[PDB]
C-alpha cells in the first residue's frame, strides 16, 4: 500500500531513475524485485535506467450557433 504511492508519486516526480535508486526508494533488498515491480507498473526500462512516459473555422461557427440559439 505504500510502495505504489511512492511509485504513483515518482511517476510524476521525475522521468529518470537509475535502478539502484529505485531500490533505494521502494525499500527493496533486491535488484530484480525492482523490474518485477516496474513491469507490473509497465515501466519501460533502459539498462538500469527507467523512463516514466479541431479547425478554427469550426470553432467560429460553434461560437455563432451557440450565440444565436
Amino acid at each position: 500500500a505504500i510502495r505504489d504511492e511512492i511509485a504513483k508519486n515518482t511517476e510524476l516526480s521525475y522521468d529518470f531513475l537509475p535502478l539502484s535508486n529505485i531500490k533505494a526508494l521502494l525499500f527493496f533488498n533486491n535488484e530484480k524485485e525492482t523490474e518485477k515491480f516496474a513491469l507490473e507498473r509497465n515501466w519501460p526500462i533502459v539498462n538500469s535506467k527507467v523512463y516514466f512516459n479541431t479547425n478554427i473555422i469550426e470553432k467560429a461557427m460553434d461560437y455563432a450557433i451557440s450565440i444565436e440559439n
Binding site: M61, A64, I67, E68
Partner: protein
C-alpha cells in the same frame, strides 16, 4: 462614342481601370466611407457562404 459612316456616333463600352497610382489614391481616399453593415451575425455568416459558392462556380 466614336464616329463611323452618313457618319454617326457608334456607342462603345467603357470601364474604369485604375492604374497603380490611382489604385493607391482612390483607396486612400475611400478608406473612411467603408460600410458598417449592421446586419445580424446570421446575416453576415450567410452572405459569406453565398460568396464562397459564387467563387466555386466561377
Amino acid at each position: 462614342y466614336v464616329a463611323i459612316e452618313e457618319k454617326t456616333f457608334l456607342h462603345l463600352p467603357c470601364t474604369i481601370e485604375a492604374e497603380e497610382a490611382e489604385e493607391i489614391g482612390v483607396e486612400h481616399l475611400l478608406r473612411d466611407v467603408r460600410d458598417q453593415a449592421a446586419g445580424g451575425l446570421s446575416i453576415r455568416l450567410t452572405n459569406q457562404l453565398k460568396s464562397l459558392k459564387g467563387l466555386q462556380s466561377k
